[model samples]
Target: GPLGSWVIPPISCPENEKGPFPKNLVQIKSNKDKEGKVFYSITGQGADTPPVGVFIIERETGWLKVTEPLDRERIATYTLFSHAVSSNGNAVEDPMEILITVTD
Candidate 1:
């Protein structure tokens, strides 16, 4: 069967809360690489503190999960984007797509 696009929901981390917010929360997906394999990765920007959480990509589902907790105040808002990579770290043909934001 052909792969279909899926939409993930939005999540919030209360002030001083920890999170492993599921990657599906933002519904970002990866593109096929030159070798035709899809590798998921997430990049985000926020307040000067930089991104405090680590994002883990699901190998089967393409979900970008937050591996660590988040500091809501430190990151009042964030912009997230995802890109696909080849086994060798080469980027795919498509560009990073904007996902969503989280507000304090």
Candidate 2:
């Protein structure tokens, strides 16, 4: 049977006294293999190295931030891949949702 598809809900966050969020929030979907295996790779905006290790996106949440503090101004935006995975290492065959909020 084919898995059902899911859509991510829109998110809104508080903005600075000046105006709305300075950066744009984007949602990225994960790529699946023919066997329905889910894998993630982030690129564009922030990733410079093929094997980027500066930031990691939560499997459930779309929060993208560096393990350490980095200049937000330098980082205008970022993208991340999300997929459906069970507790074990099995694919669910359906798309998952991730919410992201950006602030000034």
Whole-model Cα lDDT of every candidate shown, in order: 0.50, 0.41
User: What TM-score, over all chains together, does every model reach?
Assistant: 0.49, 0.34
Q: Which candidate is the best by TM-score?
A: 1
lDDT tens readout by residue for model 1, 9-98: 564544443544433344455435324666665556531125545545565457555554556555555675555666666765344444
Model 2 C-alpha lDDT versus the unseen true structure: 0.41
Cα lDDT tens digits, model 2, 1-103, are 3334433445433333232323323443333433354443334333434235444544444343444333335543345334555445765544333332334
How accurate locally is residue 32 in candidate 2, as Cα lDDT from 0 to 100? 41
RMSD of model 2, in Å?
A: 8.6
